[PDB]
Amino acid sequence: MPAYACQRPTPLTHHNTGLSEALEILAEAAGFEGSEGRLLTFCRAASVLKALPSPVTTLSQLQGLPHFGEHSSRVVQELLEHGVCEEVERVRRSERYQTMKLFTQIFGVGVKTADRWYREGLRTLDDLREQPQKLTQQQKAGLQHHQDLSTPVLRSDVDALQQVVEEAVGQALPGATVTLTGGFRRGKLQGHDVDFLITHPKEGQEAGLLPRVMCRLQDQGLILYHQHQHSMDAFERSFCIFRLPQPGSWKAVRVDLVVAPVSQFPFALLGWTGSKLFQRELRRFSRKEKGLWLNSHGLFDPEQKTFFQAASEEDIFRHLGLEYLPPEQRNA
DNA sequence: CGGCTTACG
DNA sequence: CGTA
DNA sequence: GCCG
Ligand SMILES: [Cl-]
Ligand SMILES: [K+]
């Protein structure tokens, strides 16, 4: 089993959910305590289990797997022997973990913000609503719409959303296209947000497109929160909150809109499709194993000072020496 | 031992 | 810092 | 926490 998540297919459905979820609890807790290295190892170990074809039943099966060492093997060992791991259970029942998970699940709140609020004695969402001076406008929106934003987004919502996004994009720029990315492109049936990638076949036509799209959406009354203020002034990404029509009502939905020039489209498609761990492992592999710098704009050779002109995601995998993984196999 | 994705708002 |  |  190879060491990078971008070297192995990881499907939606896998066989070690109980073991994976426990390691991901420890990964989350490591992040809450500011140990980004420990988070990564626990996430990578959990990902290794997701790629296995069969359930792990004996400790010997962990031999030869990357990212498994004394600590992660002890966690699996306890789960195999007793069905629970005492370290994991102590974490999930701890007030620190429950409060940090509660606060970091708010749109606009990360680990450092949640940790500050925790040290100040805050424990519940109502504690936050009673301290509005501690909140950015972004966090006020995440708190105001928290119940809706914690409701899982379904495929039915995605199709309705893509319709209204395509309408606004079409009114903003003839011939522009809209591509669903993110978890739903990977085959997930639920999500916490919906990601769309927007481009135009003619390079340059997409300049200034996202503000025109956001204005069309605001005019349809569809935007509840938007981070940029528009009638640097230009922007190409918007992580907004939509007022999605429902039968006789509406529901707030997190939506990401990204504009990219068509020359960068395969890199943008690869980037925004995820998963998050897949992307980190792919970019790490690119830099550390191939000496190339990858992001959502391109693939840069710092020695030749040139960008690789890709026409497809397959082109990028091939240039990196990787077997192609379709999006449904990028669920690391 | 040091590294751990890499951008934009 | 937050977003992905 | 684990790898290079
Ligand atoms: Cl990027
Ligand atoms: K958050």
Numbering used by the authors: 138 to 368, 382 to 397, 410 to 494
Quote the authors verbatim.
Pol μ is capable of performing gap-filling repair synthesis in the nonhomologous end joining (NHEJ) pathway. Compared with replicative DNA polymerase, Pol μ lacks proofreading activity, with an intrinsically high error rate of 10−3–10−5 for dNTP incorporation. Here, crystal structures and kinetics of Pol μ substituting dGTP for dATP on gapped DNA substrates containing templating T were determined and compared.
To investigate the mechanism of dGTP misincorporation on 1-nt gapped DNA, we first solved the binary structure of Pol μ:DNA. This binary complex with template T is almost identical to the published Pol μ:DNA binary complex containing templating A (PDB ID: 4LZG29), except for the interactions of the templating base in the active site. By replacing dA with dT, the templating T interacts snugly with Lys438 and Gln441, which adopts rotamer conformations similar to those observed in the Complex 1 structure. The space between templating T and thumb domain is filled with water and glycerol molecules. Gln441 from minor groove interacts with templating T in our binary complex and undergoes a rotamer change to avoid clashes with incoming nucleotides regardless of whether correct insertion or misincorporation occurred. Gln441 interacts with the unpaired 5ʹ templating T in both binary complex and Complex 1 structures and undergoes a rotamer change toward the finger domain to avoid clashes with base-pairing after incoming nucleotide binding, which is observed in all the normal and misincorporation ternary structures solved by our group and others.
